[PDB]
Coordinates of C-alpha atoms in Angstrom, one line a residue:
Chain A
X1 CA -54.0 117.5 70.9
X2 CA -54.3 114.3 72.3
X3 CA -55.2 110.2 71.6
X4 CA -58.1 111.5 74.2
X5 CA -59.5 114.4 71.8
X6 CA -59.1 112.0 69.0
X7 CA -61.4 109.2 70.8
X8 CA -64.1 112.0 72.1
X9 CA -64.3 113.6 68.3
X10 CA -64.5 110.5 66.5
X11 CA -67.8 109.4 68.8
X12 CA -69.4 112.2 68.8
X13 CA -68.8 112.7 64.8
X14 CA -70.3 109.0 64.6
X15 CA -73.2 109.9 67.0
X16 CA -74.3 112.6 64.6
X17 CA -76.2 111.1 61.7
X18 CA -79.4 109.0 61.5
X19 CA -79.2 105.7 60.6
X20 CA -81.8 104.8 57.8
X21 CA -82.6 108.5 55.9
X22 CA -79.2 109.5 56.0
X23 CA -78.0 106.2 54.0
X24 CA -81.0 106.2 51.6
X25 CA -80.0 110.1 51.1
X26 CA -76.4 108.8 50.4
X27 CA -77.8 105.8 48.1
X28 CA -79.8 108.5 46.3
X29 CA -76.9 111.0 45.6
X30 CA -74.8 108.1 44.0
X31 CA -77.0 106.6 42.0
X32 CA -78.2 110.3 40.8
X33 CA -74.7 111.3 40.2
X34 CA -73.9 107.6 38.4
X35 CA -76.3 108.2 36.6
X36 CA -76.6 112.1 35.1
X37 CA -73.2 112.9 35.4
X38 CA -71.7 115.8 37.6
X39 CA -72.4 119.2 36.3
X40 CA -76.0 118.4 36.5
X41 CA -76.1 116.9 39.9
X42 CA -74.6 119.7 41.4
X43 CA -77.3 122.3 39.6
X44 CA -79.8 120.0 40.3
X45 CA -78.7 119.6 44.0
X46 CA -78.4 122.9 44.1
X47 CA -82.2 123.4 43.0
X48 CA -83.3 120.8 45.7
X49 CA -81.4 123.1 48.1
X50 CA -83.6 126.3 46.6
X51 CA -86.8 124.3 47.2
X52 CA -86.3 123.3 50.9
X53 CA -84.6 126.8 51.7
X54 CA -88.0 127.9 50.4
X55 CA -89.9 125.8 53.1
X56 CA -88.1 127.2 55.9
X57 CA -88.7 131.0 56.2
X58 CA -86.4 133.3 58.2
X59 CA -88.0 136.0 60.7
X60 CA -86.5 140.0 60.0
X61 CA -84.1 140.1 61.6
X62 CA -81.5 143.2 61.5
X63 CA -78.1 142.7 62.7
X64 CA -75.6 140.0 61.7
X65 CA -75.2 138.8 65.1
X66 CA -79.3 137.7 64.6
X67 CA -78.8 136.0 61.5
X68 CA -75.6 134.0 63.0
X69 CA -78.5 133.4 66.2
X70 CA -81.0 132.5 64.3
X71 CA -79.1 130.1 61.6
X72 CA -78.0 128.0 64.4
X73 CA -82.0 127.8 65.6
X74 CA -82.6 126.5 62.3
X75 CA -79.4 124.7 62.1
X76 CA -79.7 122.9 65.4
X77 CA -82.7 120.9 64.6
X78 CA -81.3 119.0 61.5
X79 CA -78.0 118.4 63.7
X80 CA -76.1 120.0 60.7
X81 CA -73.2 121.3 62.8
X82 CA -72.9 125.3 63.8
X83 CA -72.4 128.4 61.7
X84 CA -70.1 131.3 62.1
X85 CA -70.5 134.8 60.5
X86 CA -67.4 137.1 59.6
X87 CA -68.1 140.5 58.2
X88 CA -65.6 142.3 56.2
X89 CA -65.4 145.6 54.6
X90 CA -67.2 144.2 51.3
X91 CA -67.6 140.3 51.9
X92 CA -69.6 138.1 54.2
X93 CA -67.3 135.3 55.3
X94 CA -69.4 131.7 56.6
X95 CA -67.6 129.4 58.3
X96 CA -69.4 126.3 58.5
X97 CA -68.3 123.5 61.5
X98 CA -69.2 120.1 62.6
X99 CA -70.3 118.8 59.0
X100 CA -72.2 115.7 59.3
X101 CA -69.4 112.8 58.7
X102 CA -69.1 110.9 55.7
X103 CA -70.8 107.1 55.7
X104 CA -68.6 105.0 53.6
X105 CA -65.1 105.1 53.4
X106 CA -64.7 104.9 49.2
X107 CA -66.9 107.6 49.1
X108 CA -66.6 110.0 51.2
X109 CA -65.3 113.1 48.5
X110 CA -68.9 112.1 47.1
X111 CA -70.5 113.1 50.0
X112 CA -68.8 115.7 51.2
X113 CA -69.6 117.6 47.2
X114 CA -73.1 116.4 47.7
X115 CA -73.6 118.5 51.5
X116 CA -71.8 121.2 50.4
X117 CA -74.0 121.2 46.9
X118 CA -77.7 121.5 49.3
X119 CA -75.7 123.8 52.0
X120 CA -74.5 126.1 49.2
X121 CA -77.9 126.3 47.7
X122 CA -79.6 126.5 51.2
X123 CA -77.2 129.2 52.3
X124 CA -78.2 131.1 48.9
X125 CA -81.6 131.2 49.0
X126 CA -81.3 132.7 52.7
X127 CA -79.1 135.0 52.6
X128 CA -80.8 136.2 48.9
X129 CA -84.2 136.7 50.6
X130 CA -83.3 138.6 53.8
X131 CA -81.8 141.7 51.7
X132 CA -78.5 140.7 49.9
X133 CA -78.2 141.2 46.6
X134 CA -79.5 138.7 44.1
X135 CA -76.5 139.1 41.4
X136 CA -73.9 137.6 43.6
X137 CA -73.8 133.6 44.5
X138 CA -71.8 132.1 47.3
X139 CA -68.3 131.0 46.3
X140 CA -67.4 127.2 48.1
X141 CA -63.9 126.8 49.1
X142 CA -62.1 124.0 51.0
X143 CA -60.3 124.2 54.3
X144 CA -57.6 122.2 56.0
X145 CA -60.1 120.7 57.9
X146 CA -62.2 117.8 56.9
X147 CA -65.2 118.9 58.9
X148 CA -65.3 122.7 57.7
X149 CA -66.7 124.5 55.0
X150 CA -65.5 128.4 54.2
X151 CA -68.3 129.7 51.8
X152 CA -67.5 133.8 50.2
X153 CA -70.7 136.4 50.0
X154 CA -68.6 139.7 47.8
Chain B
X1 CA -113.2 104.0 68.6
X2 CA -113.3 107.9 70.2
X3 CA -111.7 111.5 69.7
X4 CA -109.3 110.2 72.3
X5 CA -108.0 107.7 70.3
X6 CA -107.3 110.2 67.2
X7 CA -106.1 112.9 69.3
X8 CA -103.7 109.7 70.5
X9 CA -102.6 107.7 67.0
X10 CA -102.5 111.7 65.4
X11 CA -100.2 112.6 68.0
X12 CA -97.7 109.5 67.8
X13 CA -97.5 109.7 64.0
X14 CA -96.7 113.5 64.2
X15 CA -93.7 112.4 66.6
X16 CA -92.7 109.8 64.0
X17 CA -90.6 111.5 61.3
X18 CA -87.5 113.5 61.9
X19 CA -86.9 116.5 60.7
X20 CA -84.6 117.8 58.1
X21 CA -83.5 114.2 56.2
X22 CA -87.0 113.4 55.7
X23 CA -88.1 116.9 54.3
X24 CA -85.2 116.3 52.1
X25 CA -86.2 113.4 50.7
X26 CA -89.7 114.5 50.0
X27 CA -87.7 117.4 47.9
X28 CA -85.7 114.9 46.1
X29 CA -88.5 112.9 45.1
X30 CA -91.0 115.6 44.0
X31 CA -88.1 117.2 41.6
X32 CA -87.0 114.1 40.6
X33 CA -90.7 112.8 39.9
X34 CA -91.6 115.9 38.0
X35 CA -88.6 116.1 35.8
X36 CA -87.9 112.2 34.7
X37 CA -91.8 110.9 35.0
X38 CA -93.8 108.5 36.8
X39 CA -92.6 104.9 35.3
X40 CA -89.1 105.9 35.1
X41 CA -89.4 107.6 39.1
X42 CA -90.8 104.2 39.9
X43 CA -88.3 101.8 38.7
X44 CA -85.8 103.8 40.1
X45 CA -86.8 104.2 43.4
X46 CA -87.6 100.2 43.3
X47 CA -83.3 99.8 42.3
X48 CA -82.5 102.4 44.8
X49 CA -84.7 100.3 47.5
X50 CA -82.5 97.1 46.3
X51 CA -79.5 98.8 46.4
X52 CA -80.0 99.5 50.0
X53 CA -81.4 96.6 50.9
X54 CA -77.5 95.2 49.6
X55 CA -76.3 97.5 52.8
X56 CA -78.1 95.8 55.3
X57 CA -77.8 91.5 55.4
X58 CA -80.3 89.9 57.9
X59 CA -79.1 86.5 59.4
X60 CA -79.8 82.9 57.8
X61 CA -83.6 82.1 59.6
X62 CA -85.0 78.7 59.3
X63 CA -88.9 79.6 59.8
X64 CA -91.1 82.7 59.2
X65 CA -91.5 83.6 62.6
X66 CA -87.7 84.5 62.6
X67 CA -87.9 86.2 59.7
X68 CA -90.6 88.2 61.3
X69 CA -88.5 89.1 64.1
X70 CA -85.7 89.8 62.5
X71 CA -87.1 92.1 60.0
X72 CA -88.9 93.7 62.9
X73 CA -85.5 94.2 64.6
X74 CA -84.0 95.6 61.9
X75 CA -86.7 98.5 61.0
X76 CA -87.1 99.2 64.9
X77 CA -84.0 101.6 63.5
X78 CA -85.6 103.0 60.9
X79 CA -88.7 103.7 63.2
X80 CA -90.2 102.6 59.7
X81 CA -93.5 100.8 61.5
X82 CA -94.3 97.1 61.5
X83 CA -94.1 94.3 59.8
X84 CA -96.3 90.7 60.0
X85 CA -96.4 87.9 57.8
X86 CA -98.9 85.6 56.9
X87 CA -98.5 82.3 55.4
X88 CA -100.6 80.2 53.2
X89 CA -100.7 76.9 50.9
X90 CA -98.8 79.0 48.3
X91 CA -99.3 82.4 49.2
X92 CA -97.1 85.1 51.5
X93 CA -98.8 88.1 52.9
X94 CA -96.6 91.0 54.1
X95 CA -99.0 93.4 56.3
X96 CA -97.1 96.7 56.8
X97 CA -98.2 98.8 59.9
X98 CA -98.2 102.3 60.7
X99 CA -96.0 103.4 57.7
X100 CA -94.4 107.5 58.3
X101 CA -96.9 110.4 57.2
X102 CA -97.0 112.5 54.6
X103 CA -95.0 115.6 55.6
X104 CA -97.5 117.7 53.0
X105 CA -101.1 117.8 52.8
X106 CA -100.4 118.6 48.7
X107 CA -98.2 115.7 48.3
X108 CA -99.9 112.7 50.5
X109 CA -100.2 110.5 47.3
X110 CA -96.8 111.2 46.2
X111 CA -94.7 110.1 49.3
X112 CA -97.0 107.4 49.5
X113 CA -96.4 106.0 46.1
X114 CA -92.6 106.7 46.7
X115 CA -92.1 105.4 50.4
X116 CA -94.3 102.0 49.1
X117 CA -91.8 101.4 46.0
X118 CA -89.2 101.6 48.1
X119 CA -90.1 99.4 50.5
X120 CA -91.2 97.3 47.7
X121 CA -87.8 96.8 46.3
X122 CA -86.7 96.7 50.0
X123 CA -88.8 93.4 50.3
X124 CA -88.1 92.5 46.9
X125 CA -84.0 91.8 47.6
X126 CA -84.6 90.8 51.3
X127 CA -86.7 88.4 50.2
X128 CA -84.9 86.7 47.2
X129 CA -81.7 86.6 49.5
X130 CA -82.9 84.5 52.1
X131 CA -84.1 81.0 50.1
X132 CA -87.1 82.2 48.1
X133 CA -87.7 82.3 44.0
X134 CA -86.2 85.2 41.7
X135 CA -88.9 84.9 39.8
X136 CA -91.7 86.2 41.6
X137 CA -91.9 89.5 42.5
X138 CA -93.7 91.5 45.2
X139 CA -97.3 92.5 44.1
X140 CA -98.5 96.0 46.4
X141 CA -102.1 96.3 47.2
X142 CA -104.0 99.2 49.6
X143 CA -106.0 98.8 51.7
X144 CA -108.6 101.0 53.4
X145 CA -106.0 102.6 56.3
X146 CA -104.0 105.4 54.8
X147 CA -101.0 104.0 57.1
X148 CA -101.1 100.4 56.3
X149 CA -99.7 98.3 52.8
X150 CA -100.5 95.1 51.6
X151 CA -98.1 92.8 49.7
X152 CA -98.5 90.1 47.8
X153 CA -95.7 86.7 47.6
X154 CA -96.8 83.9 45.0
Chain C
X1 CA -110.8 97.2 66.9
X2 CA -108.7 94.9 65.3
X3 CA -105.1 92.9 65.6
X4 CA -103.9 95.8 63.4
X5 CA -104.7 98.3 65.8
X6 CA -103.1 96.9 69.0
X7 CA -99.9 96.0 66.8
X8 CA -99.6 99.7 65.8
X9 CA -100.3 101.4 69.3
X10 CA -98.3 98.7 71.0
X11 CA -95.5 99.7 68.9
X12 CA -95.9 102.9 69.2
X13 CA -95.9 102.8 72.3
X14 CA -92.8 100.6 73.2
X15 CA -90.8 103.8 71.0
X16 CA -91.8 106.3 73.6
X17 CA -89.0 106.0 76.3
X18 CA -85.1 106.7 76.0
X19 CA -83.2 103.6 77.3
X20 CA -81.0 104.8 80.2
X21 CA -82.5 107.7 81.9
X22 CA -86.1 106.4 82.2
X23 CA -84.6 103.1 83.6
X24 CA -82.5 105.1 85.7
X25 CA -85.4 107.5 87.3
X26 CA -87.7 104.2 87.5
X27 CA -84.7 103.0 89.7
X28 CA -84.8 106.0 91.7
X29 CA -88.6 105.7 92.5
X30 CA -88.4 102.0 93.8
X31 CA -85.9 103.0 95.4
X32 CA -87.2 105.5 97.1
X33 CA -90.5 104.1 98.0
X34 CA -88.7 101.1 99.2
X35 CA -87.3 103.0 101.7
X36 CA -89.0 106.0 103.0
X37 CA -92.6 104.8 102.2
X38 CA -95.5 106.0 100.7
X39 CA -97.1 109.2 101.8
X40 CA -94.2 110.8 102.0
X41 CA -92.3 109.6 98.7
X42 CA -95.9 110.9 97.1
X43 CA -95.3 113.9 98.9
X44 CA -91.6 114.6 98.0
X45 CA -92.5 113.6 93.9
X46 CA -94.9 116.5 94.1
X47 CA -92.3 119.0 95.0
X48 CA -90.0 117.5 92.6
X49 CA -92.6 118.1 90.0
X50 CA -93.0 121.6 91.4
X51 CA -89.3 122.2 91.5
X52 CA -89.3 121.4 87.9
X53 CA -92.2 123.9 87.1
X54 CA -90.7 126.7 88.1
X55 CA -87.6 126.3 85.2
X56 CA -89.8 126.0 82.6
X57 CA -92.1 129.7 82.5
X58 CA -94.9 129.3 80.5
X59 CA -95.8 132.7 78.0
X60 CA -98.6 134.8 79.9
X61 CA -101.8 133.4 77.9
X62 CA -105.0 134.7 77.5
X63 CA -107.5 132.0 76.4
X64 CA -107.9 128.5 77.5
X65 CA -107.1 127.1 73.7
X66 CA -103.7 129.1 74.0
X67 CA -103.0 127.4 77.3
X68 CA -103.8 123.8 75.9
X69 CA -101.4 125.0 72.8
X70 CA -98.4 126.3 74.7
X71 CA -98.3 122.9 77.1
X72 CA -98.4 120.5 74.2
X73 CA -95.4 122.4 72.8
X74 CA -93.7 122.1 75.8
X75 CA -95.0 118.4 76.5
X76 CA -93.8 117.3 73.2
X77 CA -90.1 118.0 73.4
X78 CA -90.2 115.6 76.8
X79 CA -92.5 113.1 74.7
X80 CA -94.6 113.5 77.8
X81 CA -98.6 112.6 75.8
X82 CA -100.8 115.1 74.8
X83 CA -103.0 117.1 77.2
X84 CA -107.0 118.3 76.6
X85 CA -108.8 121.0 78.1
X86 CA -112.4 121.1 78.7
X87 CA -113.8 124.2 80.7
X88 CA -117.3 124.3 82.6
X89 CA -119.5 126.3 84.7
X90 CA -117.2 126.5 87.3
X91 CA -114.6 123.4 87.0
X92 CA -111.9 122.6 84.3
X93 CA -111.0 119.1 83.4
X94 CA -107.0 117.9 82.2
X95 CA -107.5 114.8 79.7
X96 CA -103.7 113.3 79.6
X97 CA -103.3 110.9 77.2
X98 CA -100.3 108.4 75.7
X99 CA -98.5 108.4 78.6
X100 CA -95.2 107.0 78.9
X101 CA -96.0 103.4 79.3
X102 CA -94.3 100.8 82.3
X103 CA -91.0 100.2 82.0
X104 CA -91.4 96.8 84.4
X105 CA -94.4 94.2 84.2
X106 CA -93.9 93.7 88.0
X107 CA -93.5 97.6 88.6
X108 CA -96.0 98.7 86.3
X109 CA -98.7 100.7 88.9
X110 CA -95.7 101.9 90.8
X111 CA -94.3 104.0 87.8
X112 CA -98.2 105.1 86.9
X113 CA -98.5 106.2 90.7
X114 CA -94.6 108.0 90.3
X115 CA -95.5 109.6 87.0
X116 CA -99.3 110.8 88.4
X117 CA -98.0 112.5 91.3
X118 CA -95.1 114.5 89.0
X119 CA -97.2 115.4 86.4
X120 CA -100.1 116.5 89.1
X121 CA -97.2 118.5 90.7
X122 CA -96.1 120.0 87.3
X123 CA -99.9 121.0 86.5
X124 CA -100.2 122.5 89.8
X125 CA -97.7 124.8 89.7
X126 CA -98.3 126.0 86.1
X127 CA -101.8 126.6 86.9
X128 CA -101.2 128.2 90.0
X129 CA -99.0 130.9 88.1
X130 CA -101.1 131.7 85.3
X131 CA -103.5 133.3 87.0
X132 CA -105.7 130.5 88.9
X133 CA -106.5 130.2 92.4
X134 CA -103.8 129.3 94.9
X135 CA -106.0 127.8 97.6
X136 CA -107.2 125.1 95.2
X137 CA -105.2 121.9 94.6
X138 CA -105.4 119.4 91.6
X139 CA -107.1 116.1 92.0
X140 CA -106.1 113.3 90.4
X141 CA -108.4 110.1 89.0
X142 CA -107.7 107.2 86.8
X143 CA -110.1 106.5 83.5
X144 CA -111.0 102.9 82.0
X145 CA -107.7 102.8 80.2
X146 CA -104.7 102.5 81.3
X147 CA -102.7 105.0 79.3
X148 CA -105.2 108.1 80.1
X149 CA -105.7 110.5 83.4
X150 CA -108.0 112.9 84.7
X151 CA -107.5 115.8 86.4
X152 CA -110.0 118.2 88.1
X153 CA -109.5 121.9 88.9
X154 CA -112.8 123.2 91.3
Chain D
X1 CA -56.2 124.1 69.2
X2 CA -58.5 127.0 68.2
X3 CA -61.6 129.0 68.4
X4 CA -63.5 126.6 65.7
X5 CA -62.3 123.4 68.0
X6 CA -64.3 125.2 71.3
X7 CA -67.3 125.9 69.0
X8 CA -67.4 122.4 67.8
X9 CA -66.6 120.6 70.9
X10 CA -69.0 122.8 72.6
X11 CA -71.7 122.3 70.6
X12 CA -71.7 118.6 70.4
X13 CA -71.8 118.6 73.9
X14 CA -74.9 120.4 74.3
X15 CA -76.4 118.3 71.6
X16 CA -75.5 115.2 74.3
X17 CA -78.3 115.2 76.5
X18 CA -82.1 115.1 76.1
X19 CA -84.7 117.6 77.7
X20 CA -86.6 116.4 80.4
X21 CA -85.7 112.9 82.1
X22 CA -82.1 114.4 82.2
X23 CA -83.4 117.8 84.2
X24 CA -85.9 115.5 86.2
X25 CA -82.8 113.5 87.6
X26 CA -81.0 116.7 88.1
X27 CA -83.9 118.0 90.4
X28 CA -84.1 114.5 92.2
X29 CA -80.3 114.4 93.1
X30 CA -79.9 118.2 94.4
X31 CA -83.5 117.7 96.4
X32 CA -82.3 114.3 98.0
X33 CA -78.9 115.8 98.8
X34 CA -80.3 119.0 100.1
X35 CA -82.5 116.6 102.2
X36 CA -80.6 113.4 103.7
X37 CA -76.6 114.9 103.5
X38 CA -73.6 114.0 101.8
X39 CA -72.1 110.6 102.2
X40 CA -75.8 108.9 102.3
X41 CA -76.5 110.4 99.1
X42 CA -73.2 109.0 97.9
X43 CA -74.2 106.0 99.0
X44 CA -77.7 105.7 98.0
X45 CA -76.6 106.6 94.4
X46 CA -74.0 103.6 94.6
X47 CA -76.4 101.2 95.3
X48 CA -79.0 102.7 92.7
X49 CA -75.8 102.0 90.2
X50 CA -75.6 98.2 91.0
X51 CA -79.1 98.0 90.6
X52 CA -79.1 99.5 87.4
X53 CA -75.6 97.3 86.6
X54 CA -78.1 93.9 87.3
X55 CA -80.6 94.7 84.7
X56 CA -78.4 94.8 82.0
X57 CA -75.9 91.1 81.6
X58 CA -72.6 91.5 79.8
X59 CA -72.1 88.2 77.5
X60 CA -69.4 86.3 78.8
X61 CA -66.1 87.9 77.4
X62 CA -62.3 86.5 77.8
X63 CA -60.2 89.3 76.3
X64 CA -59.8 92.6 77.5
X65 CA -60.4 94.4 74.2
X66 CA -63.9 92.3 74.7
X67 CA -64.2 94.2 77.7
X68 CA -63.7 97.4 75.9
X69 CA -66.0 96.6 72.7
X70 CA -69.0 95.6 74.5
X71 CA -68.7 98.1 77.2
X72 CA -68.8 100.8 74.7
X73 CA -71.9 98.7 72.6
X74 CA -74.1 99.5 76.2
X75 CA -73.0 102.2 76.6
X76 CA -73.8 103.9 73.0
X77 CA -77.1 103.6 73.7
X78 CA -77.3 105.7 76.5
X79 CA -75.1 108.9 75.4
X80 CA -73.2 107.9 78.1
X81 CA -69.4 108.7 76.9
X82 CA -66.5 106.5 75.9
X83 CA -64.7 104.5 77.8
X84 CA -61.0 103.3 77.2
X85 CA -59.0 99.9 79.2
X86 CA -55.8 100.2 80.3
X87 CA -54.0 96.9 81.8
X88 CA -51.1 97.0 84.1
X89 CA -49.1 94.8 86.0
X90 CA -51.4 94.2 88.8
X91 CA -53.9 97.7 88.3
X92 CA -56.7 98.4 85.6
X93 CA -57.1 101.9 84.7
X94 CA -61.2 102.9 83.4
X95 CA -60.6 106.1 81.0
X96 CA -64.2 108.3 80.8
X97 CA -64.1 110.4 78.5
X98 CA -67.0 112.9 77.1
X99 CA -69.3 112.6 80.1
X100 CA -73.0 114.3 80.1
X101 CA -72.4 117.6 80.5
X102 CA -73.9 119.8 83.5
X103 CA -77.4 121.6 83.0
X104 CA -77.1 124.2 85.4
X105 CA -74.1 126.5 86.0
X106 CA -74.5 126.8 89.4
X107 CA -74.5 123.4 90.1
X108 CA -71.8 121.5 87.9
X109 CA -69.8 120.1 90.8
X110 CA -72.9 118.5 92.5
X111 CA -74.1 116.7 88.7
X112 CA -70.3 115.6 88.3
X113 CA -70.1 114.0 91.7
X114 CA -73.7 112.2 91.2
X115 CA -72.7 111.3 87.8
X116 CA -69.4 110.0 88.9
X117 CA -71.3 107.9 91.9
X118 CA -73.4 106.0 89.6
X119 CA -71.3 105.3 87.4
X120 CA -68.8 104.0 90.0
X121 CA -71.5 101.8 91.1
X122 CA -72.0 100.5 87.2
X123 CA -68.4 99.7 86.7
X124 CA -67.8 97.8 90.4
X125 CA -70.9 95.9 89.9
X126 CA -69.9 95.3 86.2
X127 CA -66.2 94.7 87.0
X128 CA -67.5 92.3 90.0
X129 CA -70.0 90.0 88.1
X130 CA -67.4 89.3 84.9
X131 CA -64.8 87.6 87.2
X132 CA -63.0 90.2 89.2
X133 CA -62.0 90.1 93.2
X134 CA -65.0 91.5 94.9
X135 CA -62.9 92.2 97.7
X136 CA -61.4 95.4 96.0
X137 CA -64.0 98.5 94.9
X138 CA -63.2 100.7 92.3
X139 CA -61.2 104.2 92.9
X140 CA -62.7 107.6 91.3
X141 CA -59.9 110.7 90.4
X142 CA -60.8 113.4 88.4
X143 CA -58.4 114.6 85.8
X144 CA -57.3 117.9 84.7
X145 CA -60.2 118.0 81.6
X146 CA -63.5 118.8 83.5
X147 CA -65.5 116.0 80.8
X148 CA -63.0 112.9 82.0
X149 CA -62.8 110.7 84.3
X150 CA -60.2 108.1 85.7
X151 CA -61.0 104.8 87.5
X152 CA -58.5 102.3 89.6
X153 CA -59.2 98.6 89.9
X154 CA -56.4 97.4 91.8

């Protein structure tokens, strides 16, 4: 590590959202979650995430090294970071890099529960439709890291 | 006019929305239409739009012109079309150019209704800020162009 | 016509080139031109354009309406227009429309001359590989308006 | 470090520069270096720099951390890196860091060098205008990270 890596990191992470959607999307969450409360944003969010996962369908594919591929095709034209898949001996493990940043400094946790809400839901709905099995959600967990996301298929 | 000309305008409005934020948002506001209602959506959306508006302050102007400008320069970053004012003996006239598509042929009406409320309430704040009455609000109108708004300052 | 319409295609319009690396290439043709002349800075865009076929392969089409689909979808990642095929007895005729407009109001038919010669280039070589004839070259005229070229293929 | 920093870093890198003008501009500098040589490419590029430095006016700055701000507020707009100041005694030292990466594996050295001679040209002409000697040119060395670049005004 360096004050160099620091300085290239911190632009790119600040060249990675939109200006304009990505601020209404933020004004949105906050108000909905001011609002409703917090166990029903995140179900709700979660239901959003469903609905778009629904617009985007996946071709057949039939090894993991495809999905991982083919995620990042999809993945790549939101500029919502990279993917990684880690197969186990009964789990699925999804590392998830590169999250957009956060757009205001008080509230950034908000955010960050927000992405990880429509990602969780997204993730779902995908891996659900390509063969997995529909009894089993995806368990969220944190990571050192600000900027990554570990997500648990059992 | 000629098929030239379509082929042309169809063509630039196609390149006009981005991908993934804006899909989003027509999500958020189709779930959030058909669970809460129409009046409820609408108000809202119009607080949302002042809320946001809050975000963004545009510089003291001293005639309409500037105003024009500057509200030009500022949606330039949006890529949320164009802007011209008219004035009259008591009257304001906001014409609002080439607003962004509908993203579904199912939902045209929809995204309309919610992409002119929020640029409603958008106006609305903008507006009051800069030296006019708090009174008066901002009447919509359409007109026969599916991508153009009018709006209405007494 | 109307104001409306020239406000909304003149804006349009203006959004259609990247700051920095258009500049930069319009640079390199004055440039260029400047120095070496004419015929042969004509001469040297075409193999440029050329050149820059042969990275992109087109897929091995069949009809005439899938070779007017697969170059739009490879046009509209450079935001290079739209293209329009029309087929006769025994010529074919390449509408371009919504070209990138002048970067420079003292420059402006340099860059339409520039851009001519590497899209004719560009055409020539994809044509040439899919299956036309190779003895044939494309020629080039200019319509009424300014945004729009022909091509003919005898 | 670790395998998740590569995949990030890599990936916003290859997010960094957009198809078409930026291959275009690759294929112009390898066929005008294949054509005239070397050290008249060099110089040709130089020149195209300055050029490309006069359209663009820096406002009138008197701190150095001016210097810094508004370089990096042109710069933005391009996708063209970061840059960082550092003052000595009697030299000033031009940090580049996260430079456009290469296109083409087989020619990486060739697209650093042109990258590096226009943006040598930028910086002296930039340097020269603000109130600088224009007696002394600007020094290139490369660094041991292949994306950074180091700059001596002496």
């Amino acid at each position: 590590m360096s004050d160099l890596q620091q300085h290239a990191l911190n632009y790119y992470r600040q060249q990675q959202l939109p200006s304009g959607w990505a601020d209404l999307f933020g004004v949105i969450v906050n108000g909905m979650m001011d609002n409703a409360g917090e166990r029903e944003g995140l179900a709700f969010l979660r239901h959003i995430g469903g609905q778009l996962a629904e617009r985007y369908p996946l071709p057949a594919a039939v090894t993991v090294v495809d999905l991982e591929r083919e995620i990042n095709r999809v993945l790549s034209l939101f500029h919502w970071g990279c993917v990684d898949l880690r197969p186990y001996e009964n789990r699925l493990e999804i590392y998830h890099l590169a999250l957009p940043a956060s757009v205001n400094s008080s509230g950034s946790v908000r955010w960050r529960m927000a992405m990880a809400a429509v990602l969780q839901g997204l993730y779902s709905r995908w891996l659900r439709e390509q063969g997995g099995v529909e009894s089993v959600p995806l368990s969220c967990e944190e990571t050192d890291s600000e900027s990554t996301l570990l997500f648990r298929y059992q």
